[PDB]
Amino acid sequence: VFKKVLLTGTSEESFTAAADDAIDRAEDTLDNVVWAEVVDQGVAIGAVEERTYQTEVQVAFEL
Amino acid sequence: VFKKVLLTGTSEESFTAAADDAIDRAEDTLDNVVWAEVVDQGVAIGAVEERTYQTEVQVAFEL
Amino acid sequence: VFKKVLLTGTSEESFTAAADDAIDRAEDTLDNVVWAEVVDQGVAIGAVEERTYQTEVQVAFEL
Amino acid sequence: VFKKVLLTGTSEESFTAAADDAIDRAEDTLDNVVWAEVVDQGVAIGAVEERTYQTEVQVAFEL
Amino acid sequence: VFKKVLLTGTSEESFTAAADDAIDRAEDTLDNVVWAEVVDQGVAIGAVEERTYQTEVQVAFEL
Amino acid sequence: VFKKVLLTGTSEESFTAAADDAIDRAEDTLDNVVWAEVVDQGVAIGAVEERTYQTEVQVAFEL
Amino acid sequence: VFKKVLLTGTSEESFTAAADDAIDRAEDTLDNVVWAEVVDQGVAIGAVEERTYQTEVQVAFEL
Amino acid sequence: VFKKVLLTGTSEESFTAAADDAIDRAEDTLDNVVWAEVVDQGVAIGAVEERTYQTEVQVAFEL
Amino acid sequence: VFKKVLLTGTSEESFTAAADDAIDRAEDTLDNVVWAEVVDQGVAIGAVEERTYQTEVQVAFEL
Amino acid sequence: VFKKVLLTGTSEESFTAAADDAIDRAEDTLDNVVWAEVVDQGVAIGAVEERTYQTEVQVAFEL
Amino acid sequence: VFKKVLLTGTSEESFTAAADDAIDRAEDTLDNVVWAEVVDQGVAIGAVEERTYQTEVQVAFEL
Amino acid sequence: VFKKVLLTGTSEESFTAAADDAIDRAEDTLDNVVWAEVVDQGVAIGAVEERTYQTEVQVAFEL
Numbered sequence: 195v196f197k198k199v200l201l202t203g204t205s206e207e208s209f210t211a212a213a214d215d216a217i218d219r220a221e222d223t224l225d226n227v228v229w230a231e232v233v234d235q236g237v238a239i240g241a242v243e244e245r246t247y248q249t250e251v252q253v254a255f256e257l
Numbered sequence: 258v259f260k261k262v263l264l265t266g267t268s269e270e271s272f273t274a275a276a277d278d279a280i281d282r283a284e285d286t287l288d289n290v291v292w293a294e295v296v297d298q299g300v301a302i303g304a305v306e307e308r309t310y311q312t313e314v315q316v317a318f319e320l
Numbered sequence: 321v322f323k324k325v326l327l328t329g330t331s332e333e334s335f336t337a338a339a340d341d342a343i344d345r346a347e348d349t350l351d352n353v354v355w356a357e358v359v360d361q362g363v364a365i366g367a368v369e370e371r372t373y374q375t376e377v378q379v380a381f382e383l
Numbered sequence: 384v385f386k387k388v389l390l391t392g393t394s395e396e397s398f399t400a401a402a403d404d405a406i407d408r409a410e411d412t413l414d415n416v417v418w419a420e421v422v423d424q425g426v427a428i429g430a431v432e433e434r435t436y437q438t439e440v441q442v443a444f445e446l
Numbered sequence: 447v448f449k450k451v452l453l454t455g456t457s458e459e460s461f462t463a464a465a466d467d468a469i470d471r472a473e474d475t476l477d478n479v480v481w482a483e484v485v486d487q488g489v490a491i492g493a494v495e496e497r498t499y500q501t502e503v504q505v506a507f508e509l
Numbered sequence: 510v511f512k513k514v515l516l517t518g519t520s521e522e523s524f525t526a527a528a529d530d531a532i533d534r535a536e537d538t539l540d541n542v543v544w545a546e547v548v549d550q551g552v553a554i555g556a557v558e559e560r561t562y563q564t565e566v567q568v569a570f571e572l
Numbered sequence: 573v574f575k576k577v578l579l580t581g582t583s584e585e586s587f588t589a590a591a592d593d594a595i596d597r598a599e600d601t602l603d604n605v606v607w608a609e610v611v612d613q614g615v616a617i618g619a620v621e622e623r624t625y626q627t628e629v630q631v632a633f634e635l
Numbered sequence: 636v637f638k639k640v641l642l643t644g645t646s647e648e649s650f651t652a653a654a655d656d657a658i659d660r661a662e663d664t665l666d667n668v669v670w671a672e673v674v675d676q677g678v679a680i681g682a683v684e685e686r687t688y689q690t691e692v693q694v695a696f697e698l
Numbered sequence: 699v700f701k702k703v704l705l706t707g708t709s710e711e712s713f714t715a716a717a718d719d720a721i722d723r724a725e726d727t728l729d730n731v732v733w734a735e736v737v738d739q740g741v742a743i744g745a746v747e748e749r750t751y752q753t754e755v756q757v758a759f760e761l
Numbered sequence: 762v763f764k765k766v767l768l769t770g771t772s773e774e775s776f777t778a779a780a781d782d783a784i785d786r787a788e789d790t791l792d793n794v795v796w797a798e799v800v801d802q803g804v805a806i807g808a809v810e811e812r813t814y815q816t817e818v819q820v821a822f823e824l
Numbered sequence: 825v826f827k828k829v830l831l832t833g834t835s836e837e838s839f840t841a842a843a844d845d846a847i848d849r850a851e852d853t854l855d856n857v858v859w860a861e862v863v864d865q866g867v868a869i870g871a872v873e874e875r876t877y878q879t880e881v882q883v884a885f886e887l
Numbered sequence: 888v889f890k891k892v893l894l895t896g897t898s899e900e901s902f903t904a905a906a907d908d909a910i911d912r913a914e915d916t917l918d919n920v921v922w923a924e925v926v927d928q929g930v931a932i933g934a935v936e937e938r939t940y941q942t943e944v945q946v947a948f949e950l
């Protein structure tokens with residue numbers, strides 16, 4: 195059985211690096227992370243000193 | 258990194274109050290709740306004594 | 321077996337009350353109404369004297 | 384010909400009142416506003432002193 | 447309030463049995479499981495000795 | 510001209526048998542049933558003694 | 573309250589004429605037809621002597 | 636950079652002519668119109684003396 | 699078994715004629731073409747001397 | 762690099778068996794078939810002597 | 825109230841840089857730009873000397 | 888007439904480079920490649936020694 199957690203990673207560099215930020219956090223806290231699906235992307239501008247790319251992923255892990 | 262939980266709030270009064278019901282529960286159990294996105298709305302009729310509005314939200318919190 | 325009818329309720333007060341308007345009409349004419357799913361919301365402005373909220377629902381009833 | 388503008392209204396009271404907030408602004412600045420379609424709803428929590436309902440609408444006006 | 451977990455069940459027999467695999471796991475670990483919604487189906491071929499049906503479900507439980 | 514009715518079939522055995530349950534009911538009551546499209550699938554757990562598969566179909570018939 | 577019926581019109585000439593075919597049938601059988609929304613278009617080739625355009629519409633009428 | 640405006644053209648003749656009605660208006664008022672994407676189609680019946688086809692397009696122009 | 703090819707037809711006359719352009723090409727090169735589903739429509743303006751309607755279809759053929 | 766072909770399998774028995782029918786055909790004609798994603802399901806009634814389940818899959822293979 | 829403009833940025837380097845191209849143009853011409861949502865990505869090949877990445881964003885600004 | 892092939896490119900570096908991987912393969916094997924549309928993105932983790940970005944594109948070519 196696989197389970198997914200819905201995480202939004204952030205990066206001041208790129209959408210790819212924002213995806214990695216989410217996956218890194220999943221791997222810190224979960225065993226058997228197997229894949230991620232991108233479900234949304236966006237950019238924070240107003241509330242941040244530097245433009246911040248965000249990539250939201252469903253991160254799948256095996257139970 | 259943000260994480261989302263998928264909750265359905267309920268209310269005998271309105272869709273807005275059903276959204277609040279979900280968010281209230283998230284805030285009882287989670288720190289750093291930052292926003293909610295509505296993803297579905299509906300109404301329970303058959304199994305309830307009073308019509309019950311439901312609002313399903315992804316509730317985002319900062320990790 | 322359940323069957324659904326696709327109804328748009330209207331209200332000069334709220335989206336919740338427009339949903340109720342549709343469900344009320346279903347219950348006038350159908351037995352065993354069990355639930356409703358919201359599928360669209362909108363607001364009439366041009367053709368009405370007062371802004372009118374509309375909520376479209378699939379209303380499910382048991383056959 | 385109709386044209387639509389994509390506006391997000393806000394309210395500390397309800398999703399219906401947030402829709403009205405957007406439509407009010409359209410009517411301040413545009414002639415011949417005819418209807419609005421709801422396209423998204425959400426709730427601001429983290430950055431606001433009071434929970435704030437948001438309703439995003441395409442507001443249609445006749446050219 | 448209901449909460450949903452996003453699980454992918456697997457089966458060498460059918461999509462129905464893969465849905466049951468996910469629901470069985472939810473019931474092992476959660477109280478008050480009330481319903482499941484199918485959100486995706488697929489088939490593993492390359493990495494498995496036998497074709498494996500997968501059914502992804504949001505499994506709802508009452509809090 | 511074809512017309513569609515939106516029906517949810519149920520079965521304690523499979524999603525295929527739940528689709529058949531809906532189509533059977535359409536054929537009891539309608540002439541010239543020609544095809545069905547699956548639009549949703551789910552599983553009832555909380556309110557039923559046995560897990561019950563549901564398959565919702567648009568059932569098309571020729572007028 | 574408005575209600576919609578889901579009809580597929582057909583034409584050997586165009587998608588517009590197929591939409592009209594559905595609406596014509598609705599007007600034969602229903603009072604107060606007010607609008608139609610196109611929800612699908614396609615073309616029959618295999619089972620027909622002449623290519624046949626199809627346009628599926630939700631046809632709304634006032635109750 | 637391209638920008639899009641969301642316009643609904645109308646025609647008493649066809650969906651193609653309704654698309655042209657929107658594009659014509661864009662070209663009256665904008666330089667460097669490059670393409671249009673159809674995003675919705677419908678038919679006005681209740682409020683018009685003659686059935687009126689509508690085609691909604693995102694009309695893209697180069698800045 | 700049916701297979702689909704994803705083709706975009708073009709026409710200086712109409713969306714219906716653009717659909718026919720795609721289907722004609724499929725029939726030139728494939729046996730047993732059975733139906734087509736419209737999946738997108740658009741209009742070329744910038745790169746063409748005359749406005750050009752495009753209709754994208756999945757064209758199904760029996761293997 | 763993976764490539765997908767869009768196939769509709771058929772079966773007089775079940776949606777699972779219809780998926781297998783498509784995958785079997787892909788494996789007859791392609792090397793390195795790795796997975797399939799279900800994208801649609803339906804049932805043929807009018808043109809067939811026996812109800813026929815159909816399952817449409819994108820079948821992925823490694824190039 | 826927030827308003828969104830629908831812009832397609834372009835870049836010969838990456839999808840992230842194409843998003844920035846759109847946002848840069850919004851900031852040249854608008855006050856109070858607060859966020860951007862990615863809604864589409866693509867690549868120009870035929871009409872350009874160098875492959876050109878495009879990222880379409882709704883860019884939100886506060887009124 | 889344009890035709891599209893549905894390809895998933897892969898890269899150990901970025902989503903942009905994964906899109907290029909797919910397009911490169913299309914250009915190896917097809918004449919008159921004109922554009923690509925991104926339709927999905929994801930990340931392989933479990934089965935690969937290094938995290939691998941994937942970008943799925945419809946690659947359009949002129950017939």
Ligand SMILES: Cc1cc2nc3c(=O)[nH]c(=O)nc-3n(C[C@H](O)[C@H](O)[C@H](O)CO)c2cc1C
Nearest residue numbers: 236237238239240241425427430858859860861
């Ligand atoms: C992708 C994205 C989407 C956002 N959407 C919203 C929104 O719908 N409403 C809102 O008040 N703020 C939103 N914000 C936050 C907004 O830019 C700002 O920080 C304040 O919260 C409101 O000006 C969003 C930020 C990002 C990065």
Ligand SMILES: Cc1cc2nc3c(=O)[nH]c(=O)nc-3n(C[C@H](O)[C@H](O)[C@H](O)CO)c2cc1C
Nearest residue numbers: 299300301302303304354355356357551553556
């Ligand atoms: C929004 C909503 C959706 C529902 N959908 C279903 C359903 O698909 N199937 C079902 O058996 N009951 C459903 N129910 C519950 C149903 O109304 C009733 O309580 C029994 O579970 C079946 O009659 C739903 C209830 C709500 C509020």
Ligand SMILES: Cc1cc2nc3c(=O)[nH]c(=O)nc-3n(C[C@H](O)[C@H](O)[C@H](O)CO)c2cc1C
Nearest residue numbers: 362363364365366367417418419420677679682
């Ligand atoms: C949610 C909603 C959507 C509408 N969409 C349309 C439309 O697409 N075209 C149209 O002519 N009128 C539409 N109307 C009606 C319109 O506001 C007005 O009453 C006249 O029919 C046209 O100005 C709509 C009304 C509502 C409430």
Ligand SMILES: Cc1cc2nc3c(=O)[nH]c(=O)nc-3n(C[C@H](O)[C@H](O)[C@H](O)CO)c2cc1C
Nearest residue numbers: 236238241291292293294425426427428429430
């Ligand atoms: C509906 C809604 C959606 C939002 N989405 C985002 C988002 O995707 N990313 C983000 O950084 N902030 C988002 N925000 C703003 C967020 O709650 C907060 O104000 C800061 O901008 C980030 O903590 C959103 C706010 C609202 C009301």
Ligand SMILES: Cc1cc2nc3c(=O)[nH]c(=O)nc-3n(C[C@H](O)[C@H](O)[C@H](O)CO)c2cc1C
Nearest residue numbers: 488489490491492493795796797798929931934
């Ligand atoms: C439904 C489904 C979807 C899949 N999608 C992918 C994918 O997008 N990329 C991938 O590398 N492997 C995917 N795989 C796994 C793939 O078949 C194989 O096991 C290796 O991971 C890559 O050949 C998928 C497997 C299944 C069952």
Ligand SMILES: Cc1cc2nc3c(=O)[nH]c(=O)nc-3n(C[C@H](O)[C@H](O)[C@H](O)CO)c2cc1C
Nearest residue numbers: 299301304480481482483551552553554555556
């Ligand atoms: C597919 C499906 C969806 C359902 N969705 C809901 C829902 O959204 N809300 C609800 O109160 N009950 C829902 N129910 C019914 C629920 O499981 C239970 O019977 C009671 O109605 C609420 O616990 C659903 C049942 C099924 C089979």
Ligand SMILES: Cc1cc2nc3c(=O)[nH]c(=O)nc-3n(C[C@H](O)[C@H](O)[C@H](O)CO)c2cc1C
Nearest residue numbers: 614615616617618619732733734735803805808
């Ligand atoms: C828009 C459209 C969609 C169709 N889809 C299907 C389908 O999914 N399966 C099928 O057996 N026949 C389908 N047919 C009918 C098919 O072309 C033919 O008449 C036989 O029913 C099967 O070859 C479709 C026909 C049209 C016009």
Ligand SMILES: Cc1cc2nc3c(=O)[nH]c(=O)nc-3n(C[C@H](O)[C@H](O)[C@H](O)CO)c2cc1C
Nearest residue numbers: 362364367606607608609677678679680681682
């Ligand atoms: C495509 C289309 C969609 C429409 N949708 C609505 C609607 O949702 N609600 C409404 O009151 N009127 C709607 N109208 C207008 C409606 O037909 C009539 O003119 C009055 O506005 C209500 O009877 C629509 C008109 C068109 C052409």
Ligand SMILES: Cc1cc2nc3c(=O)[nH]c(=O)nc-3n(C[C@H](O)[C@H](O)[C@H](O)CO)c2cc1C
Nearest residue numbers: 669670671672740741742743744745866868871
């Ligand atoms: C339906 C349609 C969609 C198009 N989309 C794009 C696009 O996203 N980006 C682009 O550079 N050109 C696009 N073009 C082509 C564009 O109009 C023009 O020919 C040049 O390629 C760019 O100005 C499109 C053309 C059509 C007909």
Ligand SMILES: Cc1cc2nc3c(=O)[nH]c(=O)nc-3n(C[C@H](O)[C@H](O)[C@H](O)CO)c2cc1C
Nearest residue numbers: 543544545546614616619803804805806807808
């Ligand atoms: C899933 C499915 C979808 C279909 N859709 C259509 C359609 O849209 N139009 C049509 O004429 N026939 C359609 N058919 C075929 C139809 O049932 C019958 O065989 C004749 O082609 C028309 O009565 C479909 C068949 C199946 C199995």
Ligand SMILES: Cc1cc2nc3c(=O)[nH]c(=O)nc-3n(C[C@H](O)[C@H](O)[C@H](O)CO)c2cc1C
Nearest residue numbers: 740742745866867868869870871921922923924
């Ligand atoms: C993302 C994207 C989508 C496009 N879609 C189309 C289209 O649908 N039709 C078209 O003629 N050209 C399209 N073009 C432009 C096409 O590649 C070329 O420049 C000419 O306009 C037609 O060969 C598109 C370009 C891009 C970048």
Ligand SMILES: Cc1cc2nc3c(=O)[nH]c(=O)nc-3n(C[C@H](O)[C@H](O)[C@H](O)CO)c2cc1C
Nearest residue numbers: 228229230231488490493929930931932933934
């Ligand atoms: C985007 C993506 C989606 C995937 N989806 C699935 C899936 O649904 N099921 C599966 O068994 N493996 C999937 N895989 C492959 C999975 O990570 C692993 O390689 C094995 O195939 C199962 O652990 C996917 C891989 C990628 C890159």
Ligand SMILES: [Cl-]
Nearest residue numbers: 200252263452
């Ligand atoms: Cl989710």
Ligand SMILES: [Cl-]
Nearest residue numbers: 271272273336
């Ligand atoms: Cl409300």
Ligand SMILES: [Cl-]
Nearest residue numbers: 326378515578
């Ligand atoms: Cl419907």
Ligand SMILES: [Cl-]
Nearest residue numbers: 388389640829
């Ligand atoms: Cl706009």
